[PDB]
Write a protein that binds this ligand. Structure first.
Ligand SMILES: Cc1ccc(O)c(Cn2c(NC3CCN(CCN)CC3)nc3c(C)cccc32)n1
Ligand code: NI
Ligand code: NI
Ligand code: NI
Lengths: 438, 438, 438
């Protein structure tokens, strides 16, 4: 049940009713492909051509794995975030696979089965998968060599996966995300998730959202040694599930004076996704880092700040004494809209045409200067200047919470007009300094 | 006919002569694939293997469509933009396809033809396409079952499109962009555009720029129901065509005093693409959101601000009284270049080596400290410090408009040196306050 | 030998021991595919179907090349960078290939061989490659037409490369990066690099890092004329190799007073990669633009500033008189971590739980309020609030350099709390102004 409240006083809107799925950790599995260490007619020539693609793929992956895997790591409020190393857990597992005897343990565990748990030498208990046995196919079906065309067809089919895995790694420098169906087919991933040491709620959540799991996973090319090709697939652990989440939408709140350039603006800067988490609130300032599936929101705690739950008071009383609510100030009174979950915020200033329309009937509301809001019931589009926005047509109730725009409480003569990483208190602090000198 | 003017007074350059193609709206088409609801030798075994890939693909897409489609939406002057919901129109059409009887209308309309217009239950008139009839192939060619190898080959060819469509959706969570040739082949797209309810100028523009149309389109996986696979392809509507566009390039303008750290800088912040549109100017602050093809510039109005055409006065008189031109200030006198359409802006400060070269002859100009410009006639590269820039070799005339750098009109002692979202008036406003106290 | 030093005084850490590979220029090669200008049974029907895919691909590429190739160009300290035109060199070479007689020279040079150097009409000496002769296959093997199935199989294999090259160009508007194995196979690229007019150190570096070369290259679709398909592959020139590089990591340094909101913060803004280069330092403010492979760091000089080597003094004495070290100030005392090459910086403020753990033993350190650091020896994870960071497990020694946090030297009453593009001197300059008025 999605709902939404718009706050006329602060030109912001909160969408409630979502359930969390937060990636809090990683699980590393080792996916393996067993390799073969190895007068012409037309059908044998096609076999030699496909066999050469196989050798080249192996040679290509071996040349690729002469270097340690790595990505590119750093050194509205997104600049406040820290800097992780996303594949550091997978790379550490991959580093263990280079120790002597380590690959042999995996090779031995997968001798009689395709699915095995192996505890590596450093105590890490990883699930191991043999997804393709090219050794057994090439040795039992191609080493006999003249032959037939159904072997040519079948060999192209079994080799194609190796060639595609190699292509993906070649244009991604050994590290891919999302994890394609060549790295792990849909059935392999589902059975991997089923055999995973996770709870029953996590298995259902991951199985019902495999496409999201793929986007939150990495495939890390690891080693080719002793006829074994191994890459680490690093899967999300969802350690926070089904807690309340809400999306804060903000838009500029300006005065609407007639004289151009005499207008002052403020904007709440704490927009993003918010999820209750372990007694605090996980705040994701760049809401584009989260993916929404029905009422479930998938985020990654690496792109979050951990905040006191009092941050929610900015939505009811931005002047509350318990949390210093974050705002920016400006003079730029430019018009724009923010499409919310259940409606649209319109910040209409100057001489801009701002309307809301219905498909069949056309314009049904003309906005006046200021910040205003329309629900998605009976509305299909919104227009701000030359920009047409379609609104979301999801079901749910909106509440318009009336209140005076807080920008009216500020005297333009002492208003600090270029504050970015600011708050209610910092702006009051600067006002009182300009007031002292006059 | 592309032309360019450089303004020495403000360290900026405008490239004129371009024609617009602005995505103002969306058109939603429903693309359908008709599905089949269904002792071994070598050729039959290959058929069973390909048939299993088909079942798995269907099963995979069905598991994928258990959730509502969505992307990731937000909550130099790009921070001023609003926030749309790019696939909200497609998702709304897709939501209608889940109503009872809706899929049946599409199935019936496409019974005797592959191209049909269907008015959905909510009055939306959508064009509908059947691009692949796997039902008829599997039922009339594979249900008879021993057989031959040309059936194995042909079935792999017809099934491959379904498998690739499924792969794309699987690593993109049901929403792809650009729209690949598997979603819609080049011929299907061209005939879709031809049968579209659009003007003749729009049909020619889209047909001559299909690769751009692909990049501005989305494919939204929708429903598998009653042996019909349907995905919505959401195509751009170019409601603004052939209006004048120009690209504003800006670069830092600093004083060139000898004492390090005594220099003050300003930079015009209104760089981006500008297109005349419906009596105003559509401003795209993140010029990387537009794609240039010859003299045609393709943009998306969702990444624009609608501005008074008086904003063009900042290029002739930055101190004009009709528009408050946007600038930032700093002390960071770092060297850099901006490659323009027809030349290069060089901001050379401190001890940096800045030159312009020709392929055959080498260095032909050494820049002195300040902001300067060179046309692309006779120039192939520009070097600022350890950075080599190739210049664009497109044809067209540049004009160097002489004038005193406006940074010279500012007294460094009262110059506000960390203004970002500022303007000419805001900076004068702050100067007069620091002047009052001294 | 990677090493790291943490500076408690400034909440920053430097990772030393890396070797550079800086793309300083571009090399343009012309890759060519020779084209053919051209009652049914089952095997001939499959041949006609594959032949139609071939015609459509040619027709598609011809329609694509009716426009000039282009990308999307612009107009912590990344905003200081200039703006290049990445494919301007390739596009210029491609423009020459449209002059009359130019394609014929290439066609003639590659008549008896697949590898040739051709000097174009404007004096550019480009290496030219014929990677696929579909003309000779279609004319000598398919123009004879009933036939066999091994021809159907072989023709699908030889045509597939053309179809995939066409797909890539179709969803990328004629410009791809990275350069896939369809544009240039691994062997073709290696032999291209070997025949390149570059030094022996550059050949080894590029050959041992082809996957990185691919990511730093572009493929530019160019011309279809006189049965020749030509695209320009634009390869990086690494003109700076094996100079020292180091990564600067920064994190917020705040006071740790008990009263909420009374804390002041500063953060060094000069984080990024740094490489010695030609007497200066190449600074890459967006460290995600560089790719690390073992101890080699690959960057692109287009995303760099050229700085005096004195910028390194900010790591030893941020108050040094030779370079004005860049900082930002704020009041936002939010907790976060920065994962470094060999450890983790923890900025722990307020009521946040901050710990460091080992896989087997659990929590081994609890951080107190302030900025602190832990090496990756014996540490596997770090937790700041609800965010778990895995640390990098690479080998190397860390040094903890003790010193008083410089934030303690600032009186909060005159501390400028919203400076972004600031420096040590600018902040002192503002403090002395607020001090004068009190
Ligand atoms: C890329 C970039 C470059 C330069 C820069 O500053 C910023 C940060 N920044 C500031 N900074 C403020 C400005 C005035 N302040 C002066 C105190 N009266 C100083 C620091 N205002 C901003 C606004 C409004 C929008 C987006 C970013 C903003 N980002
Ligand atoms: Ni829209
Ligand atoms: Ni360049
Ligand atoms: Ni991590």
């Amino acid at each position: 049940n999605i709902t939404e409240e718009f706050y006329q006083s602060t030109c912001s809107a909160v969408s409630k009713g979502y359930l969390s799925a937060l990636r809090t950790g990683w699980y590393t599995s080792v996916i393996t492909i067993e390799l073969s260490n190895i007068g012409t007619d037309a059908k044998v020539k096609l076999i030699k051509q496909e066999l050469d693609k196989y050798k080249n793929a192996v040679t290509e992956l071996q040349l690729l794995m002469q270097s340690t895997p790595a990505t590119n790591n750093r050194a509205f409020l997104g600049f406040l975030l820290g800097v992780g190393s996303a594949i550091a857990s997978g790379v550490a597992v991959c580093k263990v696979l280079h120790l002597e005897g380590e690959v042999n343990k995996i090779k031995s565990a997968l001798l009689s089965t395709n699915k095995a748990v192996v505890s590596l030498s450093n105590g890490v208990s990883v699930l191991t998968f043999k997804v393709l046995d090219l050794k057994n196919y090439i040795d039992k079906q191609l080493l006999p060599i003249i032959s037939n065309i159904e072997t040519v067809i079948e060999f192209q089919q079994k080799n194609n996966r190796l060639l595609e895995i190699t292509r993906e790694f070649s244009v991604n420098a050994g590290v891919t995300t999302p994890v394609s169906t060549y790295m792990l087919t849909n059935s392999e991933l589902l059975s991997l998730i089923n055999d995973m040491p996770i709870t029953n709620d996590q298995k259902k959540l991951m199985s019902n959202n495999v496409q999201i799991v793929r986007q939150q996973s990495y495939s890390i090319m690891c080693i080719i040694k002793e006829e074994v090709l191994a890459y680490v697939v690093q899967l999300p652990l969802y350690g926070v599930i089904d807690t309340p989440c809400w999306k804060l939408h903000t838009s500029p709140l300006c005065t609407t004076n007639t004289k151009e350039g005499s207008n002052i603006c403020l904007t709440r800067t704490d927009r993003g996704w918010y999820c209750d988490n372990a007694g605090s609130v996980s705040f994701f300032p760049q809401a584009e880092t989260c993916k929404v599936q029905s009422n479930r929101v998938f985020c990654d705690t690496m792109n979050s700040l951990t905040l006191p739950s009092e941050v929610n008071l900015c939505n009811v009383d931005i002047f509350n004494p318990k949390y210093d609510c974050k705002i920016m100030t400006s003079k730029a009174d430019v018009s724009s809209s923010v499409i919310t979950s259940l409606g649209a915020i319109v910040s209409c200033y100057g001489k801009t045409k701002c309307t809301a329309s219905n498909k069949n009937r056309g314009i049904i509301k003309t906005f006046s200067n200021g910040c205003d809001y329309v629900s998605n019931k009976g509305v299909d589009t919104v227009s701000v200047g030359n920009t047409l926005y379609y609104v979301n047509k999801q079901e749910g109730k909106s509440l318009y919470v009336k209140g005076e725009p807080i920008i009216n409480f500020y005297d333009p003569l002492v208003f600090p007009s270029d504050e970015f990483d600011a708050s209610i208190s910092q702006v009051n602090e600067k006002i009182n300094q300009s007031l002292a000198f006059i």
